[PDB]
Ligand binder design. Structure first.
Ligand SMILES: O=S(=O)(NC[C@@H]1C[C@@H](OCc2ccc(Cl)cc2)CN1)c1cccc2cnccc12
Lengths: 337, 20
């Protein structure tokens, strides 16, 4: 039973949420290998844990940059939520700690690369291929939303393909535990629901709108609303006229009209029947929800794996020395990390 | 084509997060 599985998941989550793991490793326990990704106030590196020989992805956030960008609370959210969750399609946090300069979150290394990379290269995914990925997101959001979590940054750049061809969601930087409404303007322009753009209070329905954007992008090869500059993107989103490629199936277009729905009383995911409106839609009729969860479905695409620690499925980024100051920076701000 | 318009756009690379 789903309700029973979700109630026990909540019990597990709540214990960790109320008593977060803290200071479970140290920087000197890892060898830093290569940069896998970069952001505004940090980077993620491939590292090897010397005691086990396991490879991990280490997210290193500069405390001073976090503060400058007013992402303190968001970063505390990210670590507190990530250490508490447990789901097959969420990248697992293994360790966290901090030093004088930086915050560190050490996570499972997912060697197949970002969905983004494969999607751009290949161009688009077939509807069955897209449906396979989409089902995993639907179940992940079912899980997260049940814990009163909104994710708030669904995009192909945050979805990693594992050695079995299944998705792992990463980056909980905008994730938040909220009952009822919140107001922060955040996300990625192409994926923002109209409520967010219009500065209304919003809720978990913004994740379901974002799923619509992801499915469209996977199946079309480009998102439903794009332009050279974000303001032009926002104009397109708030007008809400979506045009579908002629190759989209009838079922696909109907699902997307119900996800990309400006009207919150009509948006799938947000109605009295909840996620079951999505799970029971015609486009998902061939999806065995149980088998997806269990990883028993054969994946449409399996990534090339050259060995442990291989980064061939990732782009190259400029490397920069990790500096640890001899003075503690921003101690009070990150006390609970 | 819409594909052509996308590929010619400045938003085919990794898209950064926005916040207020
Ligand atoms: O950094 S990754 O390579 N891929 C996801 C990121 C997100 C988005 O960039 C924004 C970003 C990047 C780094 C940081 Cl600190 C902030 C924002 C697209 N690249 C990555 C992150 C976390 C865990 C990983 C596990 N295995 C492989 C790659 C991983």
């Amino acid at each position: 039973s789903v309700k029973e599985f979700l109630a026990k998941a909540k019990e597990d989550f709540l214990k960790k949420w109320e008593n977060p793991a803290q200071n479970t490793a140290h920087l000197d326990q890892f060898e830093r290998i290569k940069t896998l990704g970069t952001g505004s106030f940090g980077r993620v590196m491939l590292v090897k844990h010397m005691e086990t020989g396991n490879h991990y992805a280490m997210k290193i956030l500069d405390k001073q940059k976090v503060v400058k960008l007013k992402q303190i609370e968001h970063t505390l959210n990210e670590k507190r939520i990530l250490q508490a969750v447990n789901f097959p399609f969420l990248v697992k946090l293994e360790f966290s700690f901090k030093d004088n300069s930086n915050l560190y979150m050490v996570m499972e290394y997912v060697p197949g690369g970002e969905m983004f990379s494969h999607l751009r290269r290949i161009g688009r995914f077939s509807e069955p291929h897209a449906r396979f990925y989409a089902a995993q997101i639907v179940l992940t959001f079912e899980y997260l939303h049940s814990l009163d979590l909104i994710y708030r940054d669904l995009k192909p750049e945050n979805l990693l393909i594992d050695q079995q061809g299944y998705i792992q969601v990463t980056d909980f930087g905008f994730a938040k535990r909220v009952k009822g409404r919140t107001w922060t303007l955040c996300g990625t322009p192409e994926y923002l629901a109209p409520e967010i753009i219009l500065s209304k209070g919003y809720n978990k329905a913004v994740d379901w709108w974002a799923l619509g954007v992801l499915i469209y992008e996977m199946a079309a090869g480009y998102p439903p609303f794009f332009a050279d500059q974000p303001i032009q993107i926002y104009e397109k989103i708030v007008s809400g006229k979506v045009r579908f490629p002629s190759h989209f199936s009838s079922d696909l277009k109907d699902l997307l009209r119900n996800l990309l729905q400006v009207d919150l009383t009509k948006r799938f995911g947000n109605l009295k029947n909840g996620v079951n409106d999505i799970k029971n839609h015609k486009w998902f009729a061939t999806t065995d929800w149980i088998a997806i969860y269990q990883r028993k479905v054969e994946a449409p695409f399996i990534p090339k794996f050259k060995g442990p620690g291989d980064t061939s499925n990732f782009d190259d980024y400029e490397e920069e020395e990790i500096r640890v100051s001899i003075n503690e920076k921003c101690g009070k701000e990150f006390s609970e990390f | 084509t819409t594909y052509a318009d996308f590929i010619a756009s400045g938003r085919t690379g990794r898209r950064n997060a926005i916040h207020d």
